[PDB]
Design a binder for this molecule. Sequence first.
Ligand SMILES: [Ca+2]
Ligand SMILES: [Ca+2]
Ligand SMILES: [Ca+2]
Ligand SMILES: [Ca+2]
Length: 394
Amino acid sequence: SSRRKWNKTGHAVRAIGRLSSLENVYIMADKQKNGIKANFKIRHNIEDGGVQLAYHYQQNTPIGDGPVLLPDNHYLSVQSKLSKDPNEKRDHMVLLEFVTAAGITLVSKGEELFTGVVPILVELDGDVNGHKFSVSGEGEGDATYGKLTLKFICTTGKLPVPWPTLVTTLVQCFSRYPDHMKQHDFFKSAMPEGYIQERTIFFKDDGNYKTRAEVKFEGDTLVNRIELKGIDFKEDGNILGHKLEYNTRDQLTEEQIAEFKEAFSLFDKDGDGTITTKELGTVMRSLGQNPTEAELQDMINEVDADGNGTIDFPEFLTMMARKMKYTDSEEEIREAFRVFDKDGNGYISAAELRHVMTNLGEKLTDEEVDEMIREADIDGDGQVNYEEFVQMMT
Ligand SMILES: [Ca+2]
Ligand SMILES: [Ca+2]
Ligand SMILES: [Ca+2]
Ligand SMILES: [Ca+2]
């Protein structure tokens, strides 16, 4: 293992790439509609390699005339796990989700409806390129923990699109908002009368969905009734071609955890178990970037679950586990590769890699840089090209 030297520096560059991207569900007040608007990106792994991106724009407006909470800018962080019921013959999805609000550093009447376990019903009618379908869902939400458990069935037979592409459409009122953020919870504030949620979802290099849903209490049950229309999809594309992975590949060897700790400790130079903006900035400069204090704070804020302004070890483990579960785009892998490929020629040289290593305070001898190149060098040219790098980073 000088795969270790790759793994570590690789993970650090990937950590930086994560910290520079916007992966959460971003919520802002929409005062003209007495509600909220949101935007976010969803990654769907393509079975056999690559990612299909789905860019979401969202708007919510209350159904009733009672006052609602309009929030400051914040985000929701969602962890989703998809599975199959071994006893179910119908085309189906079992979903477990945990959702928590964050993004604001360190209580409405409708919030009272969510202090215990609430039953949920979901009904969707869809039409994608003229292929119609219906989905029925049932389960329960426990907003105390941000927790949803639901099972969905396609009641019309075979679903004509992959299940994962419908997860976001198929009850953000179940999100866990921390104590210091309770006044920013629009979704609960609008209950029991509910809200109208609208989205457009753009699948990159493919078609789009347009959705409209009514989310409200019907008796004791929170019911989400949705209609969806998809247009412009390619018959051979990822969606109509069913080329998307179904299953959360959510491994996590103890060994993987240990490699994430090695990367963490490159940032946590004082060994206190948390990464500060000073520390993150130290590493970013050594890699050739020059962020301002404000950008360092916004980067941390992206993964700072507890809002203390630092990336604690468990927060970094969570971020890295998610970064490994969902595939990076080509543009993101190229950006990582450009951290090493200092001149932009397509090839990481022994001189470039030594410059990176030496700038990160790795005390490696010229001989050991050579061993690093050789580990990664599939074609024997004495350099690491893009494809060799891509394989090294898997
Ligand atoms: Ca530290
Ligand atoms: Ca923190
Ligand atoms: Ca180069
Ligand atoms: Ca090579």
